Amino acid sequence: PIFLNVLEAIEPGVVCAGHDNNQPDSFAALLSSLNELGERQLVHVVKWAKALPGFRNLHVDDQMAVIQYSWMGLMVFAMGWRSFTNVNSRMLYFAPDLVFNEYRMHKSRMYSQCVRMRHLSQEFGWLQITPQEFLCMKALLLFSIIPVDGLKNQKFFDELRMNYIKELDRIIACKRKNPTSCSRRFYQLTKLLDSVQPIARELHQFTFDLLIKSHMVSVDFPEMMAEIISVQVPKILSGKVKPIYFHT
Ligand SMILES: N[C@@H](Cc1cc(I)c(Oc2ccc(O)c(I)c2)c(I)c1)C(=O)O
Ligand SMILES: N[C@@H](Cc1cc(I)c(Oc2ccc(O)c(I)c2)c(I)c1)C(=O)O
Numbered sequence: 001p002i003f004l005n006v007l008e009a010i011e012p013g014v015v016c017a018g019h020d021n022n023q024p025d026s027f028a029a030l031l032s033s034l035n036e037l038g039e040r041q042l043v044h045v046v047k048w049a050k051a052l053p054g055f056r057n058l059h060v061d062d063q064m065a066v067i068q069y070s071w072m073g074l075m076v077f078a079m080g081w082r083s084f085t086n087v088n089s090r091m092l093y094f095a096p097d098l099v100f101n102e103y104r105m106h107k108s109r110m111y112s113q114c115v116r117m118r119h120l121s122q123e124f125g126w127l128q129i130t131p132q133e134f135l136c137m138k139a140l141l142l143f144s145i146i147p148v149d150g151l152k153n154q155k156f157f158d159e160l161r162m163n164y165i166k167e168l169d170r171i172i173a174c175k176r177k178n179p180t181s182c183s184r185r186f187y188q189l190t191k192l193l194d195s196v197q198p199i200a201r202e203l204h205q206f207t208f209d210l211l212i213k214s215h216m217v218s219v220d221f222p223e224m225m226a227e228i229i230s231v232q233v234p235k236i237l238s239g240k241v242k243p244i245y246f247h248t
């Protein structure tokens with residue numbers, strides 16, 4: 001189908017972080033690389049979003065809003081996928097040049113968060129998530145977080161989102177044969193998507209605090225990276241911007 005072709009086509013390619021694996025794994029060096037990777041990934045996310053069906057129909061302000069609020073969840077989701085299809089979730093495959101092993105997970109001073117990220121990665125396994133489900137779920141994540149007071153034009157966003165959820169449906173009901181597994185599959189996926197929010201929330205908090213102490217730990221934050229984390233992220237940690245959960 002058309003929709004499925006677009007998603008597969010606009011799917012971003014490999015992206016390096018530019019990490020110098022020749023230097024010892026120090027906290028400053030590791031995170032500074034993750035921020036750079038984030039900055040770079042942000043560029044591919046914006047283009048990816050613009051090329052998304054119906055995205056260019058939202059108010060220009062909302063387009064930048066939804067992107068600045070869910071960039072974390074998206075990247076984290078895609079990261080788990082790579083880790084799953086690249087190294088069987090054994091390690092966090094952030095980038096071909098920035099892979100995290102047990103040691104690095106500790107050195108990054110955010111081991112626990114990595115554990116959850118890996119749990120998310122492994123999820124792609126037991127749930128036998130197909131490439132089609134992944135693409136659709138990831139896109140649906142773009143419309144998974146907005147301000148409590150709605151966007152510039154909620155009416156459209158609600159319909160755009162609704163139209164993306166129906167896609168997930170068609171996808172889910174494009175191979176099934178029974179009414180049981182089909183209705184259950186939707187439950188499993190919607191749950192998987194919701195499990196992403198909690199993780200992104202911890203990373204949002206961590207990066208925020210890291211930015212504030214950036215100069216005290218010698219960690220560098222790219223331009224756009226520091227501008228979003230100091231303006232958009234705070235809105236989420238303060239409760240002004242909240243994620244959209246399928247379940248309670
Ligand atoms: N020119 C591109 C799209 C493109 C459009 C815009 I407005 C951009 O501005 C920013 C700057 C910082 C941010 O955090 C965000 I989100 C967006 C960028 I960077 C790229 C294309 O045509 O694919
Ligand atoms: N289901 C179709 C693709 C299809 C996907 C989506 I997201 C749609 O949502 C809207 C709604 C209002 C808009 O202005 C725009 I632009 C898109 C529609 I309408 C159709 C296919 O598979 O060919």
Ligand SMILES: C[C@]12CCC(=O)C[C@@H]1CC[C@@H]1[C@@H]2CC[C@]2(C)[C@@H](O)CC[C@@H]12
Binds near residue numbers: 076206
């Ligand atoms: C989104 C990124 C970078 C892109 C990716 O593959 C997932 C990964 C998850 C951890 C993020 C990192 C970007 C930089 C952050 C936000 C650090 O400041 C702390 C947590 C890091």
